[model samples]
Target: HHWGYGKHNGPEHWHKDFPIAKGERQSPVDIDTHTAKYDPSLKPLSVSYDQATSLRILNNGHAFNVEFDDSQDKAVLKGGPLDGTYRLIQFHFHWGSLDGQGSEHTVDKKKYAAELHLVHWNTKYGDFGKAVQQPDGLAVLGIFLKVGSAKPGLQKVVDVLDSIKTKGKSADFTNFDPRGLLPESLDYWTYPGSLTTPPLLECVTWIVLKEPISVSSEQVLKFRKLNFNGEGEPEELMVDNWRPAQPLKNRQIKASFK
Candidate 1:
């Protein structure tokens, strides 16, 4: 169940419908900088832009989903430094109020201004959707977003927010490259986790990058302006659209590099 803000479709209603929704292994947990265990082998390889690589940008007004062309089936993992080639199925963001508090993932119980999820699947396993059901098939790369310095890297995306400012409305965006959004350091914290949303499958291998990318206050505000309502309505804005943190369930989150 894809839960969000609105009368019938909000998070509150989701738990009521699916009582187990609260018990699943979810992410965006507050990373305890001191307690986290790190691993040195997990590093991200910089992907080269080749003709076979295709990128699709959808406005989806409420948020944007940047999907890559090939399915996970086509990825090639060459080993060492390369780690593995996991096809990026989709990427989306999670945000909060104008005061810039209440993001999904927290660090030492401190919420960053926002969070971005780049969802991928290991082609060595199978289909992207199928990979979500297995214990080690899915890998999500998370990047924390704070409001401060101008992130020119995000300009490729921020520049198009205006096109889909309304709720339930989206437009096609082109000529965009996702690599620009990545931070300088690939160092990350890895762990076994599940999707933040419903079904809440425990099939994810999460990689939460240590370094956060920055966006201006205005860029953050643009996300707040989005509404859950459809076009030609009273413009019911989406305020406080984040889910509270869930239990760790005694799960140990391991970092890739200490």
Candidate 2:
């Protein structure tokens, strides 16, 4: 089967089967400000997700993703490091089974309680599946999550987790606005990397926010309730579903703000 985060299938062992796991531009790398230089002309990031039809929430045995309708550019992201408008396809979270440790990207080796990824694909490339392979085809916006007050708009998605707690389970998630979930500041770090999961395609332009959104300690627990095992299988908790920070190699991390 495909790679996963666990005893044998975990990140460290991924290279055994997937050589791309050792690729130079891999993602979720440790973000040290010392390695980031501010870009003066980088325009402010622009997000125009008019009205995302939450379509549905699904537990794909690895993570819980809230799908959106990308038929058109209803929800599009441009500005920052992107060359063209990228359509929002879906967004999901990565977290730990235990408290206080789950995020994939670390800030100076400090891991947050969780991390959210807004997966977008270049319209110029046609479709997400196809775009996921090309070097300039995908752009993923990463928002870090801290354990504190419940961030606004997050509850709307969290409230539906109960209905899709098990693998393969899904439920309607309508009229959601992706913008409301973002932090107040658009300041962020930009880099070139690959998907943190299998295939590890080096196709993403990572736009990671400098400010983290807050979520209550209790709210983060809901993500762990999801099952990595599908219906009629031995149940497994879907937590610690994050890869450890990868080596930065010689890649440069660009900052939109000082």
Candidate 3:
């Protein structure tokens, strides 16, 4: 339960609590472009999520999480460095204190404005809680974000930022397909890594896309308006929540395209 991006509870100290934070396969890896191996064998990714499966979105003190109905596989990801279908449980983002440098995973040592994670759990393990413990149990579709023109697809989520500005506050967020927000190119790199948060489970199969989606600098700043503090507490802007890139270790980064 102890974690923060502050001087005391930041990423550097995560290992003290979740030892796996410094383990063999920690996440938010640095993807070096010149060295990432291209693999034709990697199957094209398959994503099918019914908008009806989306339930609500909330701010959990860490980030704004959009929760979904994983009671069924209505929202699922198949193929592309995976053995079975993984159900979308939630989605969230990590940003920098300033624009252009807040992403978790980096490309050739470059950080983007932000990174989006569509967190999913494998169906073979039944549910999200159970699956998160097994190797190959979680799948995250990581998308990088940049400063640019407005992204119409994200307006729905942005419109409610004012309502869920505080922790534990949530509003109905149904009939929205998370899939609709992804970039056109599914070209990506895959590797084994842990969750970027505490508990740092080394069970995720990271699928980080090569192409980044765009969002205006103002919208990127809108996320910072969220309060890390709650009612009756001092206000702390939710900025720079991203963990810096971790070591590549013995793992090989596999690309889906040439």
Which of the numbered candidates is closest to the native, going by highest lDDT?
A: 3
Give the number of the best model, judged by TM-score.
3
What overall lDDT goes with each candidate model? 0.67, 0.88, 0.89
lDDT of 2 by residue, 1-258 (tens): 567887877888888887999999998898898879999989998998876666888888789898999998888899998899899999999998766799889998888989999999999988988898799899899999998897768888878888887878988887888887899999999999999988788999999999999998878877777788877788888889999888889899999987
Query: Cα lDDT for residue 180, model 3?
Result: 59
| Candidate 3: residue 10 lDDT (0-100) | 89
Q: Taking the tens digit of each residue's C-alpha lDDT, what string does model 3 give over 97-153? A: 898688999998889999999999999998788898899999999999999988888
Residues 1-258 of candidate 1: C-alpha lDDT, one tens digit per residue: 446665677766766765756664665466787888765664554434332243655545445676666543432322223245666667788787764574677778887788888776777666777777677777777888888878776776766666666654555655556677778887777667777766567777777778889888887777777665657777766566666667777777666565
* lDDT of candidate model 3 versus the reference: 0.89
Better of 1 and 3 by TM-score: 3
Instruction: List the candidates' TM-scores in order.
Output: 0.83, 0.96, 0.97
Which lDDT value does model 2 have at 221? Answer: 77
For all candidates, the clash counts are: 4, 0, 0
- Error (Å) of candidate 2 at residue 147 is 0.7
* Poorly placed runs, candidate 2 (over 4 Å): none
